[PDB]
Amino acid sequence: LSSAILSEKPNVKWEDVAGLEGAKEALKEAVILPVKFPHLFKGNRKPTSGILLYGPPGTGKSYLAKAVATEANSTFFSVSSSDLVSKWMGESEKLVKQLFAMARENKPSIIFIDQVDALTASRRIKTELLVQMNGVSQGVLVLGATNIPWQLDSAIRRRFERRIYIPLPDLAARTTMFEINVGDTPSVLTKEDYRTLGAMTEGYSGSDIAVVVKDALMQPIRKIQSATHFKDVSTEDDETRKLTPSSPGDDGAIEMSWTDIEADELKEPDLTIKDFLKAIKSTRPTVNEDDLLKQEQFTRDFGQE
Ligand SMILES: Nc1ncnc2c1ncn2[C@@H]1O[C@H](COP(=O)(O)OP(=O)(O)O)[C@@H](O)[C@H]1O
C-alpha cells in the first residue's frame, strides 16, 4: 500500500462513461474478450498487453480505463507520470517497480500509467518501465494514456501495440455529460434544453462541460447568498415550510437573510436556462483546431506499432 500509487477496485461501468461508443467497443474486444475467453489465444496468437489511450486533454481517459478495469473485474493501479517526474522524481525507479509489483500480485489487474509522454536522468526511468512491461505472461496489462501522442518516446510507444483514440464529446455525448453532471439537482431544464446546451457547447471537452456545470450549480447557492427577501412557496400539501428567495416585492415578498432560516425549511431555487448560459459563456473551450490536428496526423502515422 503506497501513497503515490493509487489502487482500488474500480466500480465504473461502460454506462457511466460519456459517449465513446467506439473506443469502448475496441477496449471490450482488446481487453475483456481475452480475459473472458483465455483459450482463444493459443500459440502465436497472443493477446496484446500494452494499450495506449491518446486524445485531446479533458476527454477523461483515466475514467474510461477504470471502466475497463471494472467491466473486466480487475484491480486498478493508477499513477501520474507527471508527478513521477515532478513531486516524486526521487523515488522514480522505485514506485515504478512498486506499482508493477503490487499489481502483479493482485491478478487480475490493470496498471494505468497516465501522461506517458511525460517521461521524456529521465532516460533512467524509461528503462525501468521497459524492463517491467516487455516482461509482463497473462496476469496484468498496462493501459497508458496521453494527450500528446507525438511527444511520446519512440521506444515506449512501440511497447504499446494497440492504440485507441479518445475524441472530444459529440453532441449526444455532451448532452449526456450535462445531464450526468447536473443529476438529481432541482432544475427547470427540459430534456430538449440539455440537447441545446449540447449544441451550444460544440468543441468543449468532458472537463470543460464539467466546469460549466459546476459553476452553473453555484447559481442558486449564490442566489440565496445574495438573497434579501424570500417567499413561502409551499402547496397546501407540503409538510414543512418551503422558503425560496423572491424578487423585490412580489405577490409574496418578506425581507429575511438566509442567515435566519431553518434547515428543513429551506427551498433551493431551480436551475435556470439562463444559469447555464451564464456559466457557458463564462467558459472557453480548452482545445483548439490546431492542437487537435496533430492527433489525426498521429492516428494516421502511428507506425512503430
Ligand atoms: N463522462 C464523464 N463523466 C465524468 N467526468 C468526466 C467525463 N468525461 C470527462 N470527465 C472529466 O475528465 C477529467 C479527467 O480527464 P483526464 O482523464 O485526466 O484526461 P487524461 O486521461 O488524458 O489525463 C475528470 O476530472 C472528469 O471530471
Side-chain angles (χ1 to χ4, degrees), residues 23 26-27 30-31 48-55 61 64-65 111-117 133 141-150 152-153 155-157 160-166 295 298-299 302-304:
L27 284 186
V31 171
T48 67
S49 279
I51 296 179
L52 172 61
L53 289 190
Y54 70 96
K61 297 182 208 64
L64 210 221
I111 291 174
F112 183 65
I113 294 175
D114 197 345
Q115 309 129 189
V116 313
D117 57 280
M133 289 194 85
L141 64 105
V142 174
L143 291 193
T146 203
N147 305 309
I148 307 178
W150 9 294
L152 183 51
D153 165 68
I156 301 182
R157 161 191 47 172
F160 275 87
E161 317 191 66
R162 197 98 172 67
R163 290 150 196 183
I164 299 72
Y165 171 71
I166 309 298
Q295 305 285 323
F298 188 94
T299 312
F302 84 107
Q304 268 190 57

Side-chain angles (χ1 to χ4, degrees), residues 16-19 55-63 112 114-115 145-147 177 180-181 206-207 210:
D16 297 300
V17 157
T59 43
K61 297 182 208 64
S62 83
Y63 200 53
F112 183 65
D114 197 345
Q115 309 129 189
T146 203
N147 305 309
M177 287 163 140
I180 296 190
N181 282 96
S207 280

